[PDB]
RNA sequence: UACCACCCGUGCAUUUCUGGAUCGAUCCGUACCUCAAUGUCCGGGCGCGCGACGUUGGGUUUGAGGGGAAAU
């Protein structure tokens, strides 16, 4: 028998294992997976693709502006039209005019019709709203997007009014609806006359928005009902400076925030009433709602931070009880009404116009940088006018004195901040910094400095674990701000984009240290309020409203400058991105089966078989594969599928873009395989596994759902010394995305494996479920985890051509996290298959583990363990091929005396020992 | 069993058919994205210029994962 190291629960074999485990599931759902088939085009053919008509079509479909479908739909809704599944529209409701947010207006108009809405839960509200707006399975839009659009675009306003019996009062609401309809362009892509085929995706985005909005509104009804007046944080809590460190506001500021919250609770009851359609200005209601939500978010965040600090303090208290008594004196509660209503994403689409956007962002980066420099200059001038000079070292010495209640310590802190920015920098920048610090000789061991900047490990300054030893005289001698300025200048001279980014970062760091030197004074509002058009958090806005501001709030406004500049830097540093257009129709997928032009020697073993392939082999006399399939079609019609799967063939897709002229027969769901016909198409590229999936469809094992054509236009960006960016368009790439339902052709319950997620790998202990006794214990190490933790910099730097221009942040690290989760899950599944056992995971990922490692483990845990959160549950179901619930035949949970619910993972060398312990805890649970 | 040896990073490359039918054999299927490995580059750290000291350590799979689109 293969040891686990040689065992191969991988690829299609692991998909088959997952599928059999899912067949054992007591509760499951039908799941699809989308496979991407790169179409094969030659360079001339790719050049001949014109993505302009496609971009027009995508803007009309996915756009939220004028001349898009969303605009026309919203206009119909606000004109006083009600949507009916089977002309699919009628004029009933009174027209709603003057709503800046059309989606919000629609949701409110539909909700006005609903009665006794407050008892209705978020889910029910969403359902009713979407039924009213999109008419189940988007049936009304079939008329409106095709024939209706033609009617509104080509029908006198008076005639429209006469047809739908509309009174003269609503004539205005109608005129914009007619004008919006006319503004829509003409669909030319995919051989489609009108927008009706695309109607599914529109329906779907609108429905997701409806659900989210309804859920938010009901969470707030709940919050407003729960508001209990007079909750206040104890004065003692506020007084504890240690507990306060890192709430980013003052105690007085927090009390002001709670009073603001009660006034806005009143305002929000009123605003939610207005949004459910009771009446009044939807736009004002929206602003009120958003402000209150932001307030309630900031308050909750602050409270959670304070609670975490409290928990840490309690953990440290330990044996000492005086500290515990002080903690009970400061003890605070988080009110149930306080609860984060997070910011909600609006409907957004179309494709970004790269060149216009790049001009805008060059301009913006230049402007923001100039403004930041000017602001810094102004702050410096105000402090100088008063007559006390900013000095980072003096300020740091004062801070150290306050913390005790030194010049060396100040210098050490400055050097440490510079060092952290250089840890964040590229290898060449790290090298420059290291060389310069060795030339200065401040570090006792240049080795320590090298390690700190390159290996990102160690600390030069500790804040009351030993800080790095330094030559004090040399340290007092070398200024650090000038060193930073020189490094920045040299990196800008390097004129390499990584080096330019590092220069920008170091300049920001220097400005930040100079500002940290500010004395403890009152500063006017003028210096404090950012002129960069940046969005500001509630706490900072409340601090800013006050005429006199502290050093820390001025620092925070400078940090806002820094953040805008950093986003603009990410936008100008990128060398590669793509503009992607996805088109999906309602029609069934037609593939083209093209038989290869060759001579096929069918096997003689095929000849003697009793299967469909055997029958087909018997009838064939022809020597060319097209002739052979025609022969099987004529003689053994049932045997066609298996013969076709085995014969020489290629898969093609028309894509309505021209392509190779081929002699092929269409393969379509439900319909029988067609007669050979002259068809055009683009060959679909894929490996043997993907081609096997399509072959299975011929037999009847796989079903293909509606196709999605993704066109990507690749772009390259270059930045000159002045930072103007130039963008160049690559040849377009077309791909077909196919959702596939695969019938699973006809163990978990017999044993159970306890999985421990350790820092360097995983540990497993396998216990027989019936006797609850250990069979074998072991450790499996994960190169992929260790590798991720190490190559963080490569991932960040990796150019992604695929990454969209719209993206405002780097997500290469997130994609790598996805691959890591994949790999750990693979190891767990492999162990399970080897022992025929069900996974047991620790319910809670340990807090001690590093951020990224912790996130990976949480994802792994979700993929197996049962969790309440919908996202987690959906991920787990998708991973387990539709398996939502399992029931154990002989295991009963001791606590409720109910048969074990497995999903299929139950919830409960160092790694090995910890896994045996988890297994033991699960054993104790079930008894 | 055999195999291979300080620990990593950074940049640049190269490679990976990994799915089926039928009775090991014959024939279909052409190979996408990502990671990884490997090679190389330059740069750290550690032990005593170098790099495991018969005995150790490490890995072993048909390298691994792929559910999109939207978003964040």
Numbering used by the authors: 5 to 90, 239 to 557, 567 to 625, 631 to 912, 919 to 1080, 1199 to 1217
Task: Give the text the authors published on this PDB structure.
The REC lobe has the REC1, REC2, and PAM-interacting (PI) domains, and the NUC lobe comprises the WED and RuvC domains. Here, we present the cryo-electron microscopy (cryo-EM) structures of the Cas12c2–guide RNA binary complex and the Cas12c2–guide RNA–target DNA ternary complex, at overall resolutions of 3.0 Å and 2.7 Å, respectively.
A structural comparison also revealed a local conformational change in the α1–α2 linker in the RuvC domain. In the binary complex, the α1–α2 linker adopts a loop conformation and interacts with the REC2 and WED domains, thereby stabilizing the closed conformation. In the Cas12c2–sgRNA complex structure, the first six nucleotides within the 17-nucleotide spacer sequence are ordered, and the α1–α2 linker in the RuvC domain is located near the ordered sixth spacer nucleotide, suggesting that the linker region facilitates the bending of the pre-crRNA toward the RuvC active site for the processing reaction. In the Cas12c2 structure, the sixth nucleotide in the 17-nucleotide spacer sequence is blocked by the α1–α2 linker in the RuvC domain, and the rest of the spacer is disordered, suggesting that the pre-crRNA is kinked at this position and extends toward the RuvC active site for the pre-crRNA processing. In contrast, the corresponding region (residues 1014–1022) of Cas12c2 adopts similar loop conformations between the binary and ternary complexes, suggesting that the Lid motif is not involved in the RuvC domain activation in Cas12c2, as in Cas12a (Swarts et al., 2017).
